[PDB]
Amino acid sequence: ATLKDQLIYNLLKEEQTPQNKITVVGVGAVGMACAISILMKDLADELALVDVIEDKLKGEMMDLQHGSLFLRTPKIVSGKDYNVTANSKLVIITAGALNLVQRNVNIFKFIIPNVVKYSPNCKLLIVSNPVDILTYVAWKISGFPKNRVIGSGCNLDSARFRYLMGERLGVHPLSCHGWVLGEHGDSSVPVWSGMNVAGVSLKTLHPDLGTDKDKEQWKEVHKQVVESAYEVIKLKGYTSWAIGLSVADLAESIMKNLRRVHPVSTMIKGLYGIKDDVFLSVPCILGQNGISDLVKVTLTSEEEARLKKSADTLWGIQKELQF
Amino acid sequence: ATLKDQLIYNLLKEEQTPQNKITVVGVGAVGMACAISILMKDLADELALVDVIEDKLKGEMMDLQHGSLFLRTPKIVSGKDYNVTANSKLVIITAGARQQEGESRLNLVQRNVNIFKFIIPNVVKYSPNCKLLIVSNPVDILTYVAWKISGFPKNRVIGSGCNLDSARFRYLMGERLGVHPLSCHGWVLGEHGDSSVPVWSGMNVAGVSLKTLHPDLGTDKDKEQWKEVHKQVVESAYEVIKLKGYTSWAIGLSVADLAESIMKNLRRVHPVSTMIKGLYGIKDDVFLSVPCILGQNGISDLVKVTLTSEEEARLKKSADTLWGIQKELQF
Amino acid sequence: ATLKDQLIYNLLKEEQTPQNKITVVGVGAVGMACAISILMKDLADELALVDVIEDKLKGEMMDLQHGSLFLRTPKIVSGKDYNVTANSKLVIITAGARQQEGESRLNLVQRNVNIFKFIIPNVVKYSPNCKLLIVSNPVDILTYVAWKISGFPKNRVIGSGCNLDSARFRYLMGERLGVHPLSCHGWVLGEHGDSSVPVWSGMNVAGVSLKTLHPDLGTDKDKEQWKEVHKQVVESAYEVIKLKGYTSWAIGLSVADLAESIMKNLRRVHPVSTMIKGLYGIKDDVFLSVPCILGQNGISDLVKVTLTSEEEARLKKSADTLWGIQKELQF
Amino acid sequence: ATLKDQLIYNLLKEEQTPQNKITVVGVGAVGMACAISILMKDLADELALVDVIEDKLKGEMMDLQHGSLFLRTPKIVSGKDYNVTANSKLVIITAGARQQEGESRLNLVQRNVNIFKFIIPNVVKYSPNCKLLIVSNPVDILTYVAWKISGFPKNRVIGSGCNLDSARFRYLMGERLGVHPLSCHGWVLGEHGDSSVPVWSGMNVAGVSLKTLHPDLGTDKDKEQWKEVHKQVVESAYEVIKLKGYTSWAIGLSVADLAESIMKNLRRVHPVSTMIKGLYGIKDDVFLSVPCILGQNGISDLVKVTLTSEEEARLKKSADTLWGIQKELQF
Ligand SMILES: NC(=O)C1=CN([C@@H]2O[C@H](COP(=O)(O)OP(=O)(O)OC[C@H]3O[C@@H](n4cnc5c(N)ncnc54)[C@H](O)[C@@H]3O)[C@@H](O)[C@H]2O)C=CC1
Ligand SMILES: NC(=O)C1=CN([C@@H]2O[C@H](COP(=O)(O)OP(=O)(O)OC[C@H]3O[C@@H](n4cnc5c(N)ncnc54)[C@H](O)[C@@H]3O)[C@@H](O)[C@H]2O)C=CC1
Ligand SMILES: NC(=O)C1=CN([C@@H]2O[C@H](COP(=O)(O)OP(=O)(O)OC[C@H]3O[C@@H](n4cnc5c(N)ncnc54)[C@H](O)[C@@H]3O)[C@@H](O)[C@H]2O)C=CC1
Ligand SMILES: NC(=O)C1=CN([C@@H]2O[C@H](COP(=O)(O)OP(=O)(O)OC[C@H]3O[C@@H](n4cnc5c(N)ncnc54)[C@H](O)[C@@H]3O)[C@@H](O)[C@H]2O)C=CC1
Ligand SMILES: C[C@H](OC(=O)Cc1ccc(Cl)c(SC2=C(O)C[C@H](c3c(Cl)cccc3Cl)CC2=O)c1)c1ccccc1
Ligand SMILES: C[C@H](OC(=O)Cc1ccc(Cl)c(SC2=C(O)C[C@H](c3c(Cl)cccc3Cl)CC2=O)c1)c1ccccc1
Ligand SMILES: C[C@H](OC(=O)Cc1ccc(Cl)c(SC2=C(O)C[C@H](c3c(Cl)cccc3Cl)CC2=O)c1)c1ccccc1
Ligand SMILES: C[C@H](OC(=O)Cc1ccc(Cl)c(SC2=C(O)C[C@H](c3c(Cl)cccc3Cl)CC2=O)c1)c1ccccc1
Secondary structure: OOOOHHHHEEEOOOOOOOEEEEEEEOOOHHHHHHHHHHHHOOOOOOEEOOOOOOHHHHHHHHHHHHHHHHOOOOOEEEOOOHHHHHOOEEHHHHHHHOOOHHHHHHHHHHHHHHHHHHHOOOOEEOOOHHHHHHHHHHHHHHHHHHHHHOOOOOOOOHHHHHHHHHHOOOHHHHHOOOOOEOOOOOEEEEEEHOOOEEOOHHHOOOOOOOOOOOOOOOOHHHHHHHHHHHHHHHHHOOOOOHHHHHHHHHHHHHHHHEEEEEEEEEEEOOOOOOOOOEEEEEEEEEEOEEEEEOOOOOHHHHHHHHHHHHHHHHHHHHHOOOO | HHHHHHHHEEEEOOOOOOOEEEEEEEHHHHHHHHHHHHHHOOOOEEEEEEEOOOHHHHHHHHHHHOHHHHHHOOOEEEEEOOOOOOOOOOEEEEEOOOOOOOOOOOOHHHHHHHHHHHHHHHHHHHHHOOOOOOOOHHHHHHHHHHHHHHOOHHHHOOOOOHHHHHHHHHHHHHHHOOOHHHOEEEEEEEOOOOOEEEEEEEEEEOEEEEEHHHHOOOOOOOOOOHHHHHHHHHHHHHHHHHOOOOOOOOHHHHHHHHHHHHHHOOOOEEEEEEEEOOOOOOOOOEEEEEEEEEEEEEEEEOOOOOOOHHHHHHHHHHHHHHHHHOOOOOO | OOHHHEEEEEEEOOOOOOOEEEEEHHHHHHHHHHHHHHHOOOOOOOOEOOOOOOOHHHHHHHHOOOOHOOOOOOOOEEEEOHHHHHHOOOOEEEOOOEEEEOOOOOHHHHHHHHHHHHHHHHHHHOOOEEEEEEEEOOHHHHHHHHHHHHHHHHEEEEEOHHHHHHHHHHHHHHHHOOOOOOHOOOEEEEOOOOOOOOOOOHHOOOOOEEHHHHOOOOOOOOOOOOHHHHHHHHHHHHHHHHOOOOOOOHHHHHHHHHHHHHOOOEEEEEEEEEEOOOOOOOEEEEEEEEEEEEEEEEEEEEEEEOOOOOHHHHHHHHHHHHHHHHHHOOO | OOOOHHEEOOOOOOOOOOEEEEEEEOOHHHHHHHHHHHOOOOOOOEEEEEEOHHHHHHHHHHHHHHHHHHHOOOEEOOOOOOOHHOOEEEEEEEEOOOOOOOOOHHHHHHHHHHHHHHHHHHHHHOOOOOOOOEEOHHHHHHHHHHHHHHHHOOOHHHHHHHHHHHHHHHHHHHHOOOOOOHEEEEEEEEEEOOOOEEEEEEEEOOOOOOOOOOOOOOOOOOOOOOOOHHHHHHHHHHHHHHHOOOOHHHHHHHHHHHHHHHHHOEEEEEEEEEOOOOOOOOOOOEEEEEEEEEOOEEEEEEEOOOOOOHHHHHHHHHHHHHHHHHHHOOO
């Protein structure tokens, strides 16, 4: 017989559907950082990568496979074809190119039907920008119920905010609580009322917190969050590590059904006086069926107005998109 | 009082010196993969990054910082100046010249030696008691160069060496056998890369020797062509370079595994490059990979592997070549 | 309206089923050790506990529940009714009667069998596709009993077997050699406990055979008495019982290690007890420990270890003795 | 030549003073649950166990050591003699007397003080620069006792305090809301146990205050009986003792969490007992739980929680009671 047959007696060949599979579509710096963080957190028993650039895709796959000794994910696959994504619990989209929106919409027109073909019951986690519009696009094309379409939204915005908060206060980010919500990016909203350490509201201690009458200009913290993005791009040409970690954290709650609360993009129709089909970030409960619940944050009139304004602009763009 | 003073009462401001600090020098693809893997394994209470390209360095540092909420390493710093690296337990060198030969009129050994000539004395100044882990290529020559320049004892200079080679070999082995690479044991030793040596006699699952079951294993007589497994390790390197331009994930995962044994004083055995004088008839100051016991003192012990005459000749040939090059170096 | 509804808007309500449920049956010293180890390794999204002592059961459940903040296992349930165990991927049996003064091990067997006659049908009823992992003693016999009663295919019935014997062996080996047990390879096989078999030919560090290096290894001629290392494994069992009244931490950790490979489909190789009829000249339905590949279908494969004549005779002796007891058991 | 020397060439004969060492004193259920949790979280490179019952102590150590293969804490030691504890970064005290039927919790204190009179000077003798983490009950008084006997600055003496109460509370809150305890924030402060104070104003999910949404939160007139949640925290303590005879898993898990912030200098905020003189009109040397920042120097900062008038009155009453007891203690 072969060496393998001399060495190993087989009891059954009966291979099985992968039980905890995750796919990452798009193997740019963002997708691969998602891949590595997911791998080192032992969240999946199979990982699939998809891209249109065949060379890089094989390269990244092999590089990951070569680390198998140090991981606990026994099967890593990749391909142009979506048959490699079959039976994913979680499919994470990081692929992408106003005109930029239609191009990413056209990309999604190809990706989403393929993903849905091979993992009809998967959850979709959208990272591609602009994330709130593209979460809408993903939801529209897939036909999935809203709970199964999660946009990264303000997850990154909030993580950066809490890092910066932690810096100012001399406290680990984990113990510095604060929510950045609404539209991901430039137009996000820092909810000053919720900012606290150990349940001590900073706004209560300092009622001018985050206003232009704030002596300490905590507004700058939120502004630093947005400038940070442009700076990191200017400094190294892309962003990778932080988004990747943030995405793996969402994957963790979902894959392990933790029901933790995260700032992610979800259908916000019916809230804050919004009536259109737009996705915005609120704190959501994440688990095996995706977003099952959301927290009803009390917003001020000014905060509601910002959210409302974002929704109007997003719908303005969305209604003109060609599917 | 400020909002900070209203929220927080301070007991003292003393001290603040890191207990488990790690430094990565050279934040390219390899360095940053080492960094992320180390952060996600909770090996350090502090991570420092150094490079000569100031913008990239700052961007990379910020990016890692922005992920703080998802990590347990509370302080990440960076700078051109080595003062950020002070009091490191472990310093990892992944710096090196660009691939495009036209960037310089010197060859890679020369360029990377001049780079080490700049890096090593500055690391030593600020972390005299650190362990040095050398990744940069050619890794065996450069581990020797780090040893010569640092003045460190042998145990405190560790070359990545055949750690990646072995990790790749076990991956491919696990694929042929249908067994996780953790349970597929096999050692690739000697000179890192093209000239590495797969030690057939030690390849086993559960203490059952593959060479014993299948005596043609590794020979040209072998009908299953197991020699090709080692050949595939070498080809993999060049293929991944062609496909994506560099390698990062595997090497970075492999470096973190060494850092784990070192930072936690595990005394696990890894295939890494160490001063090999005294073994295999090798009488020169050369570094080659053999299985080494890694802990808080670096390489405290090495395993004396019984090699075949061929295997021994290959290691000896590598030592001859390496020393041939090294003897002409100017410090 | 409740504060819950004031605070939280529900999107959908459907009760979902756990995707990675594990049951522990018997919440004595061993059971709870397995539980805490499984909780701390993030292996399950749901943990169920089952016992017949109702107050202890509830208390153990509550105590675990109270650490939820520091864990990532969202639901922990308990009850004497096996409906709490529905759809477990893995069911660990650690239930066992207490051996009385003047009671022999032979006598104990039938008492543990009677316990299994109640437990096994209930398990199979609510989780017909689970992997059964048997810890209860004498473990090789009770693994057979579990297999008999359940009607399961042999791949889904796993005895803890020589997994603990092997962990203790490798710990002692590591102490002798000054190497982490992770890097000290060695297999204790056959019948768990007193009659287990240390396979000298497979002991190695970095693939370097200790027996090749030291031919008298494990024989009476051995000046270093390595045979006493196996003897210490056996004596250590009795000594821990004598000192603290039971063994818990080591067994719990060893069980979590197996659980990890099973739940994560790792295909690592472990020394566990499996149906070995057809090997080593054994014709009887008996379970003994060989290295097995563990994944989501239990034992998909086993490694065929090359045993010396003495080693085979010792396994065959165990099989004859085990069968001799098994033939007289009342099911 | 010994087999070890044939197999292994030694580079240097070691050995560094312990670098990341933890001692646990008292190996009852609490101490051992702290031990296993610390071990499974890779917080220390050396662990030491102390107790006055020698066989139990030895057995527990052997049991942990036997699990080494599955751990990454390479040195585990124990002894009645405190030299085993030398150079610990962190020493965790879980030793205490058995409270006898009909004994007041009053003179229980002094019995425990007598234990500390022996323990504390011994700890200081061998690790004069450690942090003390006190678990033994009544924890706020015994933390004061360790402070006085040790001579340590207040930053280096930490009481487990309301850490467990808060973890139970957040579990219960998480149950009601259908949210993971990690996302359910809420602080139980003051005196550990019966007289602890649930701080209703800080209780929140995602920064949304439950007290603001629900003004009756914490009152008797509250239709939803949220006050019962804090009541259940204290009732669950007596209930767990009634059902299983002791508590272990949750306290163990909570202590490891504190240990993690200390050993890794995380500067996370925890509800633990600290010397509170100067706050809340408290004018005596007493230790009560407030949110503290924990890192390498123990408690470096504390969060100044805004308390209501009757929350303040509750802390002050505990202070008065605790002090009343302490000033009668014999050292
Ligand atoms: N939501 C958030 O907080 C953040 C979102 N992002 C966004 O993530 C996206 C990706 O970022 P990068 O990796 O830096 O971009 P990238 O351009 O480096 O990577 C994009 C990848 O998508 C691939 N791709 C394009 N069309 C495809 C198709 N039809 N099928 C499969 N793959 C396809 C490309 O080949 C490319 O490899 C961007 O849209 C970026 O703006 C980035 C950071 C944060
Ligand atoms: N030993 C092994 O198994 C492996 C070794 N390598 C080697 O690792 C090295 C790095 O790999 P890559 O990340 O792809 O190279 P890279 O060019 O992408 O990164 C090198 C970094 O070193 C920096 N650097 C140059 N001079 C410096 C100085 N004086 N001080 C500080 N930093 C300096 C550069 O600015 C650059 O950022 C290469 O030599 C490569 O061959 C790569 C894979 C495996
Ligand atoms: N294979 C191995 O390496 C090892 C096996 N063991 C075995 O594990 C078994 C238990 O060990 P310990 O936890 O120390 O004993 P233990 O007495 O502390 O725990 C046994 C538990 O089994 C429970 N039980 C009895 N009948 C039951 C039933 N019908 N349903 C559910 N639960 C039931 C008891 O109530 C008790 O709680 C013993 O048989 C022991 O020999 C122990 C150590 C190692
Ligand atoms: N602060 C908190 O939140 C909690 C505190 N506790 C307390 O922790 C303490 C221990 O709990 P258990 O482990 O269940 O008690 P236990 O009585 O089972 O264990 C106590 C151990 O301390 C040892 N000991 C006694 N005197 C000693 C000495 N001079 N030196 C060294 N060791 C000595 C005993 O020998 C015994 O093994 C108790 O006081 C208990 O009240 C328990 C749960 C929670
Ligand atoms: C939405 C985003 O622009 C913004 O609103 C700025 C902003 C503010 C606050 C935060 Cl937290 C982030 S996270 C983040 C991104 O979302 C992408 C950023 C980026 C990339 Cl990947 C590439 C080119 C430019 C940029 Cl700003 C990097 C990066 O850090 C981004 C955008 C970028 C490109 C196309 C469309 C929209
Ligand atoms: C030592 C190496 O050449 C070899 O012998 C080929 C080889 C065989 C077997 C293995 Cl396991 C590896 S690991 C590995 C490297 O060491 C670097 C490789 C590489 C890079 Cl980073 C850049 C350009 C070319 C190459 Cl081959 C990538 C990669 O996968 C590499 C070398 C590369 C550049 C300069 C000097 C020497
Ligand atoms: C199989 C076992 O006896 C042996 O053969 C001795 C032995 C040798 C080597 C190893 Cl590694 C172990 S592991 C182990 C056990 O399996 C149970 C031991 C034990 C318990 Cl829990 C209770 C009473 C006595 C014992 Cl020996 C503790 C313990 O450490 C045990 C047995 C016990 C009771 C009934 C029937 C059989
Ligand atoms: C301070 C404590 O009494 C209380 O106030 C009750 C209480 C209320 C709320 C919480 Cl969170 C806890 S945590 C906890 C303990 O601290 C010990 C408890 C306990 C043990 Cl270990 C043994 C006998 C009785 C008890 Cl109540 C168990 C347990 O869960 C305890 C005490 C117990 C014995 C001696 C002296 C003081």
